């Protein structure tokens, strides 16, 4: 094989050693912690057993660390019981968190719930099951009308469409979460309920003051809101998740599969990694095999052009992990051998001609020499047959290009001189066991320029 | 709007003169009646009940009859007790019929089954919940390996990947269903379990034997041997169910989204109408909104290509059946909305042609003289942006259209002449609102041929 | 297969019935009359001997009026004698008449010379052999600075290229031959030196105004000025006559090609019928077979996509007609095999692209075609189909004209009352007419309830 | 600028300094020697006073060596008076050249002729201007029945279509004439009456047994025999010289302008270097200004693709040199302005077909290529990029000949150990040339780590 890449949450099933050996085997590629749970010590751990296992075998993954993030919820229910809303009646929020719940009124945990609210607004308690209009908004109180009837049980999710929420980026947590994330050396960081580009921007400047200017910021889209603002947080992030789940609590669900493919789609013209995440194959944490709707709404996203595919449960706490990954691979490699390319700045120009010569000459192998892994990554943008061997100095790099699709890091010595590049890179080929003798590759690279330009294309037999 | 078909399987929520209203109007285009279940009387008020709307209302809908089949079955068990099989057991079917199950063996509903399969061949029971491996095959009984832990109940389907199955095309029940189908002068057939050509021919010499060969055989693929003999079974059928839920019980799932995706181009090709069912809103039997995942496999379906999609408990005994019509009615006009015209015999040049000429000229309507509705389907072939209005004598014909995507069936006394289409057409357009004063239209007819020839093509300003 | 269509100027070598019957073996489509020379009762002679050749053999062919036009020469010089001017000399023009020339002066036929030209002005003398600068314009007299060394003889023509000169298009003797024309009912009219639209109205305006309405005009453009208002030109014009030759005189030499190639390419999109002519086979005049280039020229401008060509010399003076008009067709026929066809708002246009698409990719060898006008069967060749044109017309105007578009079969026929009748009848026609036989797929395009000019309609028939 | 390049004929009147000078100004790229005429000393100075202008201006030229060939003529006649040979008449071809001939029978130059002939085959005297069939043969005489009237000279030229002649490509005159050509160091060896792939053999390794190895051989395509072995002579010539004038002497005239456009086509397609010559601007040895015929064909041979054009007598005898040379440059750049590239299994053509097409995505004004041999100069070429090519060597032979290739600017240079090391000279070089400026795209192709004959890398630059 596949050239998708597979995003895997760990967590107790398969944080050991002999489990990580047993998940890259199978077809994981990026190791994604989420901090909505655990504490510093079990992620540190999952950390060092990947790398164990890294160091011992010579295969390659990265560490992405997914931030808990800012969310609206309801609070708390006398006796902790659920309770009976009924369509028509008047119910109220109160940004008052010394209140305990009933059928009439609840606290909501955000202050500003009374500020970015109007009469006539929508309000959507736990993932949509309840809806609401407000009446009224007086004092601390915002006053409702139960649009239809519902249970409501304690401390449930609240979304309110369409309007602009004022909560910051980051919570105290995430600020110190994303501090372990530069200590351990991670090499993503995926950001909750990303709003707008200040949201991303507040992120990147908090990484580069403790080290972590290389850290690549994956923005999670999974509201309105988000989506509305996509374009500026594209331009500020280095990639995207798209969150079907959450994003279609809040937008109309015949429009999911549309926002999900024009994401994909900008990520792709981007230069821009993305990974499709959440209600992938969530049958399997009971279930050893997926449901068909499963496995063809996982091999419609690569088609959209993914780079990655995302487990979350699946592989975290699920009684079949390893058969998570192996059918999530198998449904890459059947989807990725049927693709073909997409052939429509110097850049572009070199990347799409190199792609284009490569099928001409039936390359299986187009090989990039990448400091920071732009070069890679504009290759990657036309879905070449051909495989990606990206040579690079820089291990973070390295690192993150394990996430873009169809392509092979490999770390090397610095490389001196363009020819120098065509000597050892033809070796290396033959080495990844990649190509062969007599094949055809393709050599991408920049000569006698600032990085981030790629401007020489080069064909040679090995 | 929408050009996407929908068909709705009608049930005791629905079956009402009034109920049946509000479906057309929420956009249901095509009566499904499931004779798995009802008798006649049941069946006969639907039918009448919808022709009493359609008089009423001017509407035109078609009934299609959807057959029970031929299938598999595990029988009884002691007490009616589930039982548990434990992995690596022996169990054994046996064709003895008067046997009651029990942990160690079951009776078969299938005489054929020790002769149809062979040692080490598999043996699917409940969906394919539990499998097992055939060890040996001794007089009456087959002898199986149990490959994994279940609960065998009462009355299970049993199915045989990559065997085939010596079963007729009808049983007893569906022989006697299709003829009260030809006395109600239903307009089409589906025809459960098509394993192989000759199933369709049976079928058909069924029919033509009660004055039903114009009744519309639409063959639903629902195992491996139909999907292996599909292009005989395309060949000799009118039409094609894709049935994916069953589909997916007997191949590997992750080939069941490029079989859906095969077949429906193949149809497309072959001027033949296309139904996308099960798995659809499922979901909506007990909740007013569909799943996400839900909206995203029907629109990848309409995006495929297919004509029509399909209901089925969601609108027979659901609580929401008017909520799912609309739903799939939004997600049917969403899609639509953004697709493309496909380009790429007289017929097909001329077809093709005319739905090149309409887009250049900006034509809203192309308007087809057919007398059983092969031109219309010809052009729907090339997905036109326009919609197709289809004049026909033949009310058989004018019923079978509203299943074909983008067509507006209209029926009309015999026109003698190609001019006498022409001044007849244009009336037609301007009075069906579908295109005003000024407009193009492109008219497609056959001048001086056989029936089933299509050969002319004609721009005329409204 | 030929497509092209070879029209031949007739003079006294080729006059006769059994020439012209020969001339129409060997690939002539349209005879041209130049009335730069001959008599009305040679020329109706012509017409006549033509007439009874179409008669007896039942070939078609089209006529074509070529006017003289309204030129500038210079006049006579004592003794007759050619006269020697030197660059840097001063040479005079003078508009009086009586004046018998001299190494300084000589005499215009056009009393506007002192008018129409500027200081500054290009005066070209015998086909631009002697090139003069105005410096002065004074009474009668357009005095001028010689710029090239050169011989002048008597008789000698005047191009002032980039002056508009203020004469109609028409000179008295063109409004007597037009008049002539339409009491022979000629098919064409070739106008000579078009300069601008007013001049197409002039010669509209005349030939209605005696009952040739119907007469197509086929403006030429032969100078500068023309070339420069040749959308106009084109617009007012039914065709075009590109005069190489005379254009070659006022412009630059490596503008001549883009110059033919551009008026045709530009007459193709507007469904109007051209010609290319002047200084094809001239050789022949005196020699049995054309010079390597002269066959090149001719085939250059069949593929630069010319609907005619033309023999001018060759084919009424020269002592090879039926050699030159035979290796003109075999030309046609080596070219017209080689070339495809080009497919590229309307509902005309929409139609008759489409109804070409249809024929190539159902291998059809014939188009039928239904014409009251010719109009239908012009927007079909548009597009440079493989497939023979048979347009179907009872217009008999229309099924002369015709004869001039590439690839485009005539048939008179009575009138046909329905588009389905226009199926069943067009059907046997194209077996009878032999381009198409049992089997074959046809496309036959027409008008259905359309107001004439329109073509809608396009069907696919096997015969 | 122009891109297509220019062969000049020099003769008497353009053999000075001087006139070479003036003649480069115009636009000359290549002189052409042509020995049919002069003898060694002649040639030797026009090369030496080439040489001593381009080292006085800089300038660079290429010199080519057109040999007489192989011809077979009639021979004198009783009082060197003409004949009339009557159509129907028998006349008879001795090899004895002691006869001197009259209207029954003349001497042949080839005592093969009684050889290679056939009873049936065509004989061909003048330039074609008489036909005849042989009849029968006898001993020393070929009797014929003549085809057509016409009077016959003396020494006139014999053509026989279709019959191979079994004399090698090289006369003891091309001989030594090539041995002359090593001497001085021609960039190329144009050779007559190529017919077969062993006659281009015989010239390669006559050129390599003196020392001219890297002296490009340019086959001259003349006849019918040519013609029919074209391909096995592309594939064996390093060129082609198309020379229409004599290849329509042999075979039939409509065939010839596809015959020119097919043997540049398939030049082009090889990388080989294709010079359209003969019947160019001829009117000119007589007259300061071309016909429009004569420009027309020009720049239709440009447009079918020539590398090329070539001035016969026109630069070397007439009275009009600079002015030819002057009016075929403005021909040449009208008609290159107005072409397009052409875009369309090799490593070589993939990279240089790649660097043209983004040459033009990112509109660059220069192409730099770095050669040995001049192959990859020439397979860029291949696609006819609107920018120009600026070709780096370290050989001077291989600098000289590019000058003959279309669009291409060679550049002597010290040889380049690196990629890199082309990349920062080759953009030092690109500003130094005056074809590009500071800021513009240049695409720079070049072989990194292959055998020289490969080209594979291609590089995007601003200078």
């Known amino acids: 094989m596949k050239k998708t890449k597979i995003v895997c949450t760990i967590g107790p099933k398969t944080e050991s050693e002999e489990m990580l050996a047993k998940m890259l085997d199978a077809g994981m590629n990026v190791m994604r912690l989420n901090f909505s749970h655990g504490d510093y010590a079990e992620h540190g751990q999952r ?141 993503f960081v995926a950001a909750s309920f990303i709003r707008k580009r200040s949201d991303v921007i507040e992120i990147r400047e908090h990484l580069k003051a403790h080290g972590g200017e290389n850290i690549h910021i994956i923005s ?84 959209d052009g993914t780079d990655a595919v995302m487990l979350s449960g699946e592989s975290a706490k699920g009684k079949y992990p390893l058969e998570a990954v192996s059918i999530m691979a198998t449904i890459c490699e059947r989807t990725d051998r049927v693709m073909n390319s997409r052939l429509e700045r110097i850049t572009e120009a070199v ?40 040579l690079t100095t820089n291990e973070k790099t390295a690192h993150q290009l394990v996430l873009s699709k169809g392509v092979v890091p490999q770390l090397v010595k610095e490389i001196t001189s363009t020819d120098d590049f065509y000597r050892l890179g033809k070796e290396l080929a033959l080495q990844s066991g990649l190509a062969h003798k007599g094949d055809v590759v393709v050599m991408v690279s920049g000569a006698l320029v600032p990085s981030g330009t790629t401007n020489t294309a080069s064909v040679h037999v090995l």
């Open 351 to 390: 990347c799409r001609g190199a792609v284009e010569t490569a099928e001409k000459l039936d390359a299986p192998l187009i090989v990039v020499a990448t400091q920071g892994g732009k070069s890679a990554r504009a290759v990657r943008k036309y879905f070449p047959d051909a495989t990606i061997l990206a």
């Open 220 to 303: 999670k889209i999974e509201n309105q809101e988000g989506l509305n603002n996509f374009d500026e947080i594209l331009e500020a992030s280095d990639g995207i998740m798209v969150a079907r789940g959450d994003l279609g609590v809040e937008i109309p669900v015949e429009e999911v599969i549309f926002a999900q493919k024009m994401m994909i789609e900008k990520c792709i013209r981007a230069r821009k990694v993305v990974i499709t995440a959440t209600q992938m194959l969530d049958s399997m944490i009971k279930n050893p095999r997926p449901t068909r709707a499963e496995a063809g709404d996982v091999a419609n996203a690569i088609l």
């Open 47 to 187: 950390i060092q057993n990947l790398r164990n296992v890294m160091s011992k075998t010579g295969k390659t993954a990265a560490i992405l660390l997914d931030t808990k993030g800012q969310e609206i919820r309801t609070m708390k229910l006398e006796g902790g019981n659920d309770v009976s809303l009924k369509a028509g009646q008047t119910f109220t929020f109160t940004t008052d968190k010394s209140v305990i719940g009933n059928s009439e009124m609840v606290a909501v945990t955000y202050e500003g719930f009374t500020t970015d609210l109007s009469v006539g607004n929508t309000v959507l308690v736990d993932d949509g099951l309840i809806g609401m209009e407000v009446t009224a908004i007086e004092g601390n109180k915002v006053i409702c009308k139960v649009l239809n009837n519902g249970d409501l049980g304690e401390n449930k999710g609240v979304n309110l469409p369409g309007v602009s929420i004022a909560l910051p980026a980051l919570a105290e947590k995430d600020k110190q979460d994303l501090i372990f994330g530069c200590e351990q050396g991670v090499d």
